[PDB]
Amino acid sequence: PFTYSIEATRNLATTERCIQDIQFQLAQQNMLAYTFGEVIPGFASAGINGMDYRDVIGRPVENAVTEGTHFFRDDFRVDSNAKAKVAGDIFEIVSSAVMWNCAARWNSLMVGEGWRSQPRYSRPTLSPSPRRQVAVLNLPRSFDWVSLLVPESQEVIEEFRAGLRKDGLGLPTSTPDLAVVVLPEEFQNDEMWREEIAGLTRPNQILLSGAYQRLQGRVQPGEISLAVAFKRSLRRLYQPLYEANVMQLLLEGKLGAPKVEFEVHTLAPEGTNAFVTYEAASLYGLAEGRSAVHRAIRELYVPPTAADLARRFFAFLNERMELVN
Amino acid sequence: PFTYSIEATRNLATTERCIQDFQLAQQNMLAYTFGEVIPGFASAGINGMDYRDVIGRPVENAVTEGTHFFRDDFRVDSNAKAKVAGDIFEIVSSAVMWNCAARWNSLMVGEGWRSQPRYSRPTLSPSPRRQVAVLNLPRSFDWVSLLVPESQEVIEEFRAGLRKDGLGLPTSTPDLAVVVLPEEFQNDEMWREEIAGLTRPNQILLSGAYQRLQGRVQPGEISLAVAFKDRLYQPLYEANVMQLLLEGKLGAPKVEFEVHTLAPEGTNAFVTYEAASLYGLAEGRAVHRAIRELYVPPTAADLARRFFAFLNERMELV
Ligand SMILES: [Ca+2]
Ligand SMILES: [Ca+2]
């Protein structure tokens, strides 16, 4: 469970143990199923929804360390580098699950199924419409977000990349960790995008991490609205800022997307200089010089609680999806 | 000298020593090691020497001095040696480009082509309006102050309008800038004289040359910005910022960016720096890269002949 249980750990089969004896390995798939198997932060109890998000993200590693100490005692040993990489993966996966349930509750409201009240969040004021449904896509590592686009838009990028290569120029690259896109019209009556998950069980982990495959080749460029980069400890400042401008140049510029925004989530920013740096206007918006300009990175967001993450994403959808007819 | 001399070190006053108390006095190190030697413009052995050994010579000479004068307890951290080596890497390379510009400017005003050492004579049509100045910029320097006041008013109005809507002006801080010599300075001989070495007056002359051109450079007269170096995207981003502000908002014909390094950590840096300039793609009019090259100078002579080739090609547009 979210709180460590000796009886639940004892009932775990060897394939379910959060610590895999090989040196020892942190089985993050079992860590999420053990800690968040019945708890989606922000959509659970009031104590968990209002808990410090750093303690919520750090709970699976703390539960795994307790299990390894129980079974192996002083033999159990993991490096700080291993505990850091897993915590960063959990920070991204858990936050993506919160946004997934936000989209599910949002999509339910858009199709006319009302506003779920447990837990209590402010009902969006935007007029409901099935065409305003969204999909939260946790993108794998080194994933080409161009593959999300419809074939006629991939050909524009492919011809543009080929022409630049003939002049010795490279197509600027960009790899966000997550993308929020308008739900394709052919999927606006599929109930899977409206169902909130009760916890990060193994089937639900596969559902969320693989949802990007369902939308490959089906997204219009203008339907991409938000990209997210997860840095558990933002030391490493200019790659997201550069890649945010790259996405806006290719989507808003070469593909005519109305607005493509970018934000960085972090748990411990190293100073306040990163907030000033991320106030910079989008380089493409300044280059076009015609339409209204927004920042390359809309916010350096430090989630205090999981409920604030859900509230903030609900407010984003209520304001951003108004631009969709 | 470039080669350590016990006799020369003994003649130095205590204030002229490379080791002070330990601290690496880089101004004394450059005057000791390169007081009579500008790499690429000195002996053939130094011009063709491995550039890492040339940049690493002042630190080695300073360590030798500290060893000879503080045998029992001399010690300098590897981080302190790395910081001074990085500063010497910028200053020495900036001095090479200074003498390149001086020999270039001498040719532009019709004084012929100096032949010692031998470099390929530019095929460009000489013209005093094609002279250039090499400006080593201080840390956190606002290069917009180089621009004429009318152009500064455009940037400040641009930043004020952005700040009114909660937007920040994108920042960029190159280490060095190559600009066309202002027309009021195109007959002053200081820009045509090659320095014989990095003596203390010549160090001040090169480090303070930017103050002579503040408020006097037209935006289109900026041609090349240089940065001396997991930390890969800040120069790439600031390169696009300079091109956006100069080529875009100020109408500069071409502003190129350069990153010089003595040791690239990996190989993905060269592939990453092949990216086209973001502004050039947005304008859609002859697009060039954001960073024209990730340059690893093998020798000081290669630094000189590469900068000569850039000027011969770039200054034809003027
Ligand atoms: Ca991802
Ligand atoms: Ca500098």
Numbering used by the authors:
A (entry chain A): 2 to 23, 34 to 246, 249 to 338
B (entry chain B): 2 to 22, 35 to 242, 248 to 303, 305 to 337
Please, what does the article write about this entry?
For the filament-forming sequence-specific DNA endonuclease SgrAI, the process of filamentation both accelerates its DNA cleavage activity and expands its DNA sequence specificity, thus allowing for many additional DNA sequences to be rapidly cleaved. Under basal conditions, SgrAI is a homodimeric and sequence-specific restriction endonuclease of 74 kDa with two active sites, one in each subunit. Each active site cleaves bound duplex DNA containing any one of 17 different 8 bp recognition sites. Three of these sites, known as primary sequences or primary sites, have the pattern CRCCGGYG (where R = A or G and Y = C or T) and can be cleaved by SgrAI in the absence of filamentation.
To our surprise, we instead captured DNA-free SgrAI, without bound DNA. Two copies of the chain were found per asymmetric unit arranged with twofold symmetry to produce a complete SgrAI dimer in its apo form, which we refer to as SgrAIapo/DCA. The structure of SgrAIapo/DCA also contains a divalent metal ion. The Ca2+ bound to DNA-free SgrAI, SgrAIapo/DCA, is coordinated by six oxygen atoms arranged in an octahedral geometry, which are contributed by the side chains of Glu103 and Asn149, the main-chain carbonyl oxygens of Leu150 and Asp188, and two water molecules, respectively. The role of this divalent cation-binding site is not clear, although its occupancy in the DNA-free structures suggests it may serve as a reservoir for Mg2+ prior to DNA binding, because Mg2+ in sites A and B bridge the protein–DNA interface. Residues Asp22–Gln34 within a loop region are disordered in the absence of DNA.
